[PDB]
Design an enzyme around this catalytic site. Structure first.
Site, PDB file in Angstrom:
ATOM      1  N   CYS A 149       0.884  -1.140  -0.190  1.00  0.00           N
ATOM      2  CA  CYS A 149      -0.081  -0.055   0.135  1.00  0.00           C
ATOM      3  C   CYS A 149       0.829   1.287  -0.053  1.00  0.00           C
ATOM      4  CB  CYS A 149      -0.985  -0.022   1.253  1.00  0.00           C
ATOM      5  SG  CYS A 149      -2.118   1.023   1.239  1.00  0.00           S
ATOM      6  N   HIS A 150       0.929   1.945   0.780  1.00  0.00           N
ATOM      7  CA  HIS A 150       1.816   3.105   1.344  1.00  0.00           C
ATOM      8  C   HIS A 150       3.271   2.690   1.950  1.00  0.00           C
ATOM      9  CE1 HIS A 150      -1.503   5.712   1.034  1.00  0.00           C
ATOM     10  NE2 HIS A 150      -0.889   6.894   0.984  1.00  0.00           N
TER      11      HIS A 150
END
Lengths: 171, 170
Positions: free
Chosen positions: B103-104
């Protein structure tokens, strides 16, 4: 009369929105919130509710005399736009040397302009490396003015930031 | 085999829980590393997680892999005044130790300065920054580049979990 576009998603740092908005309005400039949908509400980290004035799909950037990009996690949200519309909007300002003001995480959106090579900026620590990888000369100062681009790091810098943004608009 | 998980507040809950459960099902141990030992950090959706080891004491040689959950936890970690999470991650990229980020999460790997020429994916929000760090960014459910495993979003977790387990079984 001059007006300022403020691009805003949820989880903005409340004071990064309110304090520069108040400084700009006190100097006699008006502000307009540009976000995903006109009349939707976005909510700050600390709960401040702001109504969006103009949808990003309709917004004409040439209508505005300056862009303001508040920090928090609003800029990260804006960069999640599948069509990259906030980056494209900001590109008008960087391409045409229109006053552009960003505080905290705000300068994240400027990376999406692809226009930062050789520009001098500051930002919150979290984002400085990304700014330098985007070609900027990154410095660690309370406010940085590079022609039309004004940047600051954190809410504690607001006095300096607000003074400089209103000056740039007086031009 | 022991997996370091670097974690701050506002991690994406299932980015933590789902790989941690996959790793533990495959027989591996996980150790949460955060700002201060025995504090709690809280996910975006309220999941509470106890920090086992403070970053000040953590020695990255202790661990057989690094896992970086997403959300706004990686941003928080990148705010550390002395860049201690980037420095922790550098051991893994320098020494080609399994490194898993969803994701991040890959934002942390930017701070290693070790991404030039490496092939990764991530959530759309951070792809530009990965490209600017010199990474070859692709849009796939899971990407394996030698030791580095990346995925984009929670929907990819099946694929992520399979690949991170497979790395450790080597």
């Amino acid at each position: 009369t001059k007006k300022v576009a403020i691009i805003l998603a949820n989880e903005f740092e409340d004071i990064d929105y309110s304090s520069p908005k108040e400084a700009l309005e006190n100097a006699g400039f008006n502000t307009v919130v540009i976000g995903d949908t006109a009349n939707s509400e976005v909510v700050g980290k600390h709960g401040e509710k702001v109504t969006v004035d103009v949808g990003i799909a309709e917004a004409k950037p040439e209508d505005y005399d300056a862009l303001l990009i508040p920090g928090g996690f609003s800029p990260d949200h804006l960069r999640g736009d599948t069509e990259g519309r906030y980056g494209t909007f900001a590109k008008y300002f960087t391409k045409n040397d229109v006053p552009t003001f960003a505080i905290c995480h705000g300068p994240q959106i400027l990376i999406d302009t692809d226009d930062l090579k050789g520009r001098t900026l500051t930002a919150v620590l979290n984002v400085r490396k990304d700014l330098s990888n985007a070609g900027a000369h990154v410095v660690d100062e309370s406010v940085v003015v590079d022609n039309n681009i004004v940047t600051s790091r954190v809410p504690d810098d607001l006095d300096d930031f607000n003074r400089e943004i209103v000056k740039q608009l007086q031009l």
